[PDB]
Write a protein that binds this ligand. Sequence first.
Ligand SMILES: CCCCCCCCCCC[C@@H](O)CC(=O)N[C@H]1[C@@H](OP(=O)(O)O)O[C@H](CO)[C@@H](O)[C@@H]1OC(=O)C[C@H](O)CCCCCCCCCCC
Length: 239
Amino acid sequence: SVLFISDLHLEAERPDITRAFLSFLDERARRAEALYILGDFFEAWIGDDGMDAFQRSIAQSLRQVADGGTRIYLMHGNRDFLIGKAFCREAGCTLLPDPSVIDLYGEPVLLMHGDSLCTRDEAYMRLRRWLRNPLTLWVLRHLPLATRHKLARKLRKESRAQTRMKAVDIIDVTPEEVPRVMRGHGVRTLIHGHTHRPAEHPLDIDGQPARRIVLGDWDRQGWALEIDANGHRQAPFPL
Ligand SMILES: CCCCCCCCCCC[C@@H](O)CC(=O)N[C@H]1[C@@H](OP(=O)(O)O)O[C@H](CO)[C@@H](O)[C@@H]1OC(=O)C[C@H](O)CCCCCCCCCCC
């Protein structure tokens, strides 16, 4: 089987999430063929050269699972898009671009963090385009660590303020973007996180059934999607 998780927002100040995550590695990820982490694994990332002791310990825990035979894949999210290849080597994982299509038991499956589908959130779209500009990425990776933390705090603070003012249908995925991107990639299954609204959404693409599976965030309970050759299940578990 293969496991999918996202939106853990791991940080030292949430040991309830960390404990649940490590228990998840011990009870489930170790016996899976692969684990996919679809963004927002960490609460924030300021660049691989700014990794702190907590983040390093998380990497070591991932690496123990990878070294035991489970393949681990990590995709960027809006919190942790600065993760680079050094971190991935340390954690024993492979960096996957957003979007990626994988072969899952003979079916092509599209993986995204999900924020790129939230096209009605125009202020966020402007921010995202800027953050992912190669010039921005270069600058951010070459600022003093103290300065990076200050910018990260500012971004979090302004984001929390603005998001409290946005209706659900500003921040959730744009409905018509879903068939657009799924058709474009030739898939009938899409898995993403970001929106904190765990669910499975049927839809019709060109007359055929399709599904969009949304991974749950770990703020109040853990979530995992498990897929094997014969079916799938997403379910929560306590922190
Ligand atoms: C080294 C510096 C870079 C470090 C990067 C590490 C990031 C640390 C966390 C901050 C980034 C991220 O949280 C911001 C973000 O993505 N917010 C959108 C997201 O809400 P979350 O709060 O992330 O859950 O999802 C919401 C739903 O999709 C969406 O609405 C939120 O986006 C906003 O609220 C954006 C506002 O609308 C516009 C904010 C403009 C901010 C201007 C100040 C930036 C200063 C420069 C930062 C480098």
